[PDB]
Design a protein around this ligand. Structure first.
Ligand code: NAG
Ligand code: CL
Length: 349
């Protein structure tokens, strides 16, 4: 019972290199719950940048390497030991082969992230999704941000198509970033050197990216990049969204030009890092369903050890279960208050 690969029938919706996009599916006929997972793994924001990603990470720009089956992990696992509350769900894994944070709507690379999602949903309706009660759009890293950019379009899509009983919800893991100033400025030459703001501004135009309608209308024409930042887009969303976010996300630190060795940390950097945690906590204050441990890490929800981390005595699977119950003792808002990564003893290594 692996998830099984299906390539999109509309052959014009493609990965970056023109190969067909697709999705992996494990059906569970007794369940009315669907979990659609968006894979993450950075992005590229211009031709030179994508060329470089093509040479070091070709698998994220193509379908040509995808095996026909894959075993679900963490929240996609069918083993109750690994997924105690959601193991019986219908499981969908959408691989990330568009390098556009799932926003693309476009010789050259194609960027069709948002179209891919639109198309997957359409096809899943013929494979059981039409009888769903709950559709959880989940994602890690770029896929996390992707949830925030697409969850309401999916809700609108299903309503337009005549399926108003499906409850669409979001689960965004490691996709909630701050468009902050770097620790030390560096010119936008790479993907790792590049300030969060500049990466996206460049990317959006290069991808023909789209953002949620209501977030689009909150910023000026051409300033759609704002909606890539969770704390700005979140209040515009209608679907309920659970935000999982490490307080000291490695990708956040990377774009902030912070490169931790094993060494003692300098004064300037202790203030920076600590202030990052503080600002992140502040943005989460407004999010009623969240799980934000004080750890230095990146992604969690499809890692097999996702059951191990705890905030205030509650595990992440249990927090999500408590969130299911709240939408149908059991806390849903779980933010570490301690000021430095690994002050929580259940952090992974
Ligand atoms: C197939 O996908 C392309 C690319 O997005 C789209 O423009 C076209 O309308 C689609 N065709 C059908 C029949 O849906
Ligand atoms: Cl098959």
């Amino acid at each position: 019972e692996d998830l099984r690969l299906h390539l999109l029938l509309n052959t014009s919706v493609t990965c970056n290199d023109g190969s067909p996009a697709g999705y992996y599916l494990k059906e569970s006929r007794g369940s009315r719950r669907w979990l659609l997972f968006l894979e993450g793994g950075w992005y590229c924001f211009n031709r030179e940048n994508c060329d470089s990603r093509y040479d070091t990470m070709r698998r994220l720009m193509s379908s040509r390497d995808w095996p026909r089956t894959r075993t679900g992990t963490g929240i996609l696992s069918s083993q109750p030991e690994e997924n105690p509350y959601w193991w019986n769900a219908n499981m969908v894994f959408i691989p990330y082969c568009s390098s556009d944070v799932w926003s693309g709507a476009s010789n050259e690379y194609a960027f069709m992230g948002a179209l891919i999602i639109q198309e997957v949903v359409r096809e899943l309706l013929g494979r059981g999704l039409s009888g769903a009660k709950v559709l959880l759009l989940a994602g890690s890293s770029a896929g996390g941000t992707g949830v925030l950019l697409n969850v309401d379009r999916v809700a609108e899509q299903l309503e337009k198509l005549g399926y108003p009983a499906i409850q669409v919800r979001g689960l965004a893991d490691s996709g909630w970033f701050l468009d902050n100033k770097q620790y030390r400025h560096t010119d936008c030459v790479d993907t790792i050197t590049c300030a969060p703001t500049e990466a996206i501004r460049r990317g959006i135009r290069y991808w023909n990216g789209v953002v949620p309608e209501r977030c689009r209308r909150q910023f000026q024409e051409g300033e759609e990049w704002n909606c890539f930042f969770g704390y700005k887009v979140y209040p515009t969303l209608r679907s309920p969204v659970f935000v999982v976010q490490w307080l000291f996300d490695e990708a956040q630190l990377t774009v902030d030009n912070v490169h931790l060795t094993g060494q003692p940390v300098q004064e300037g950097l202790r203030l920076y890092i600590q202030n990052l945690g503080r600002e992140l906590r502040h943005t989460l204050k407004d999010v009623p369903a969240s799980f934000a441990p004080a750890c230095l890490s990146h992604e969690i929800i499809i890692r097999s050890h996702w059951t191990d981390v705890q905030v205030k005595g509650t595990s992440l699977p249990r927090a999500l279960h408590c969130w299911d119950r709240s939408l149908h003792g059991c806390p849903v808002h779980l933010v570490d208050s301690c000021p430095w990564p690994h002050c929580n003893p259940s952090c992974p290594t």
